[PDB]
């Protein structure tokens with residue numbers, strides 16, 4: 086109920102939302118059917134439009150007008166945005182040369198530069214170049230401010246997940262808005278685009294910027310605008326709020342445009358019909374900037390121009406139907422479109438089986454335009470699993486396609502030519518970032534970054550302490566002239582032991598053998614030296630990783646590699662080695678095929694054993710430092726130490742062997758050497774975070790050897806590839822992966838072929854940030870470089886994406 090008989094007189098676009106049954110006058114009242122009777126008349130005036138003409142200059146104030154051109158309008162804060170241009174001989178903001186904003190130039194009583202966030206739905210990254218002739222205001226902000234060539238959204242690349250990620254710094258799995266449509270089985274309630282359930286607060290986790298601001302005494306403009314409030318009025322309302330007295334005036338504002346998404350869905354991302362919506366957004370930007378210029382705020386306010394996601398060409402004829410794969414198509418509920426989420430139609434159906442649904446959707450047609458995954462097997466870079474609202478069964482749909490249950494869903498609902506939601510590394514999904522103002526840099530290009538990082542920066546721009554989030558605070562310091570956040574490296578929690586030779590061969594009863602019984606003072610001191618770390622500078626280039634949790638581990642040195650060996654997990658947490666451009670690849674000699682050797686520095690009790698692998702008919706083993714890259718015959722024996730062995734499914738050893746035998750050398754040749762750090766990951770509860778021992782669900786049969794869910798590698802080299810990886814004087818270049826450790830290669834439809842036809846494609850799909858590995862391992866990398874810590878944080882958030890330009 087709403088008693089709509091109250092009045093909006095003197096309350097238009099009030100900042101504090103009044104509670105039912107009282108009638109509302111705020112920018113959302115329309116969306117709740119709660120505005121007072123007179124809200125349109127008083128608060129949504131339209132008379133005479135949005136622009137001053139010559140003939141209105143100096144007019145007698147008429148309060149019916151949408152905006153004013155009378156002499157008192159600047160003091161009332163309600164001139165039309167072009168008033169000064171038309172009536173006072175001023176130039177439009179866009180026509181002014183750009184001049185560096187070295188310090189905030191604010192009117193008296195402004196405590197801090199305000200922040201205005203201007204968000205554009207569906208604004209694909211390539212619009213900045215392809216539309217540049219029709220967006221002069223936006224192009225000025227872009228070239229005069231700080232810009233990225235694109236900004237990576239979160240998955241799924243849908244509207245509400247991305248806008249709420251922008252607001253919170255959180256992955257959708259953590260904030261809870263995991264799609265535009267959701268079912269929460271605990272609530273037993275459904276969230277949709279249409280309707281009232283979406284306003285209930287329980288969907289929305291984390292702490293969005295407007296709450297963070299409010300808790301720390303920074304006032305926030307209401308961020309949300311009912312769809313029928315036209316853009317011109319939104320801008321006028323922001324500018325009016327900016328003329329409030331100091332104690333009432335917000336410090337942070339938001340404007341949201343439904344365009345160009347709205348037209349993009351209808352016409353495709355580059356339809357001829359898209360030029361006008363881009364023009365109209367630019368004109369809105371021009372209004373805001375002219376309006377700030379009038380208020381003398383144009384060299385005071387920080388403006389962010391940001392998109393939620395891009396737009397791809399998609400038509401109804403490019404739809405895959407589940408009825409063409411599943412027999413039981415009426416026993417499921419599909420969340421459809423540019424991703425798929427599947428669950429049982431009825432919780433009372435005990436004949437529901439995810440495994441048979443997955444098998445029926447796996448590599449069934451030669452051109453199949455989607456791939457099924459149990460959510461835990463999705464690429465970890467998507468961070469799309471740890472929420473009860475994300476269904477176990479997921480379909481990653483190819484760009485340009487849709488998935489639907491049955492053909493009738495597509496015509497009893499062609500219409501549309503554009504859509505989004507695909508994998509967040511897809512080029513068409515990338516979106517935009519521009520920062521302009523005193524706090525941002527002047528005429529600065531920055532590398533692409535993820536939208537999860539922006540919450541921290543928005544907090545920095547307002548002097549707020551961010552709530553805990555998925556950004557890496559400091560990784561975007563290079564966007565800012567001032568207000569940088571100066572983080573320190575986390576403290577190492579566990580120090581390593583440095584064991585020497587402590588055990589005789591015969592103390593081990595591991596069931597292993599090796600043909601290594603073959604015998605020199607010249608080289609005897611040399612091998613001693615190598616076991617004490619004489620080559621450690623070559624193989625550990627960026628310092629040892631810091632262990633950020635309480636555990637027992639040993640540093641083990643070798644000629645060709647160094648490791649941090651966990652006495653709790655019975656395997657290395659990390660293994661570090663450098664392969665130069667000139668390194669040679671060799672075979673595993675015939676006599677050493679099954680060689681595994683006790684490590685006389687590590688007790689039998691803290692060692693794996695070969696017997697467990699012999700008896701576990703499913704599980705085999707591999708090595709972290711590859712025997713193929715041994716520097717000499719003698720050094721190769723180090724690679725068969727029991728302390729370098731890790732459990733691997735035979736199916737996964739095909740992937741791993743190819744990586745180690747072929748790809749490491751290829752990367753070293755291409756990048757002028759590489760440093761590799763590899764290791765295991767345990768994430769059985771798929772939360773993105775290092776498992777403790779008591780979370781491990783699988784061991785090598787009959788043993789306490791835990792089975793990794795994933796294996797990682799971090800591959801680092803010199804950005805200036807004229808310098809070799811191991812003598813690099815400047816910035817670094819990195820690529821990394823987190824490969825799922827799976828007992829089959831069902832994910833790779835061409836896995837019956839030679840590894841050269843499918844392994845690298847798998848690896849590319851599972852590309853990762855160093856930061857993703859940090860979360861999953863509790864390790865902290867790049868502790869000892871010559872580079873600034875903020876640059877290193879930037880490096881750690883880098884994602885090598887493998888898309889063309």
Ligand SMILES: *[C@@H]1O[C@H](CO)[C@@H](O[C@@H]2O[C@H](CO)[C@@H](O[C@@H]3O[C@H](CO[C@H]4O[C@H](CO)[C@@H](O)[C@H](O[C@H]5O[C@H](CO)[C@@H](O)[C@H](O)[C@@H]5O[C@H]5O[C@H](CO)[C@@H](O)[C@H](O)[C@@H]5O)[C@@H]4O)[C@@H](O)[C@H](O[C@H]4O[C@H](CO)[C@@H](O)[C@H](O)[C@@H]4O[C@H]4O[C@H](CO)[C@@H](O)[C@H](O)[C@@H]4O)[C@@H]3O)[C@H](O)[C@H]2NC(C)=O)[C@H](O)[C@H]1NC(C)=O
Pocket residue numbers: 255256258259260261287288289290291468471472473553554555772773774860
């Ligand atoms: C990305 O960044 C985010 C933010 O930093 C990271 O997420 C955090 O990670 C922490 C570790 O996983 C997690 O900490 C736990 O919080 C428990 C209480 O949390 C509530 O309070 C906070 C503060 O306001 C709030 O933010 C939480 O909000 C969640 O839940 C509501 C719904 O209830 C959602 O609306 C909201 O979106 C959010 O959901 C997300 O997180 C929850 C987990 O909280 C997931 O289940 C959801 O799927 C979704 O992803 C909460 O309202 C706290 O009680 C925990 O303590 C347990 O663990 C400690 C270990 O120190 C143990 O010693 C204790 O005994 C205790 O265990 C007891 O409870 C167990 C669970 O029932 C039980 O089994 C035991 O036997 C014990 O009885 C713990 O500290 C933190 O909440 C989230 N924060 C957010 C916002 O998600 C995220 O990790 C980052 N991602 C990556 C990849 O880095």
Ligand SMILES: NS(=O)(=O)C1CCN(C(=O)N2CC3=C(CN(C(=O)c4cc(OCC5CCOCC5)nc(C5CC5)c4)C3)C2)CC1
Pocket residue numbers: 202203204206243244245248249251252265278294308309310312339341343346391
């Ligand atoms: N879903 S779809 O098919 O693509 C299509 C459906 C039709 N769609 C459509 O008509 N609309 C969608 C829509 C509106 C109005 N909205 C908001 O006002 C809003 C702005 C906003 O800002 C956050 C800022 C944070 C800082 O960083 C900047 C952002 N957060 C939200 C929610 C996340 C809380 C909403 C969202 C209308 C447009 C989208």
Ligand SMILES: [Ca+2]
Pocket residue numbers: 206207243244245346393394
């Ligand atoms: Ca959107």
Ligand SMILES: [Ca+2]
Pocket residue numbers: 767768769770771772773774775776
């Ligand atoms: Ca975990």
Ligand SMILES: [Cl-]
Pocket residue numbers: 243263264265266420
């Ligand atoms: Cl969705």
Ligand SMILES: [K+]
Pocket residue numbers: 697698699700701702703704705
């Ligand atoms: K075995």
Ligand code: NA
Pocket residue numbers: 830831832833834835836837
């Ligand atoms: Na296969």
Ligand SMILES: [Zn+2]
Pocket residue numbers: 207244346347350505
């Ligand atoms: Zn859309």
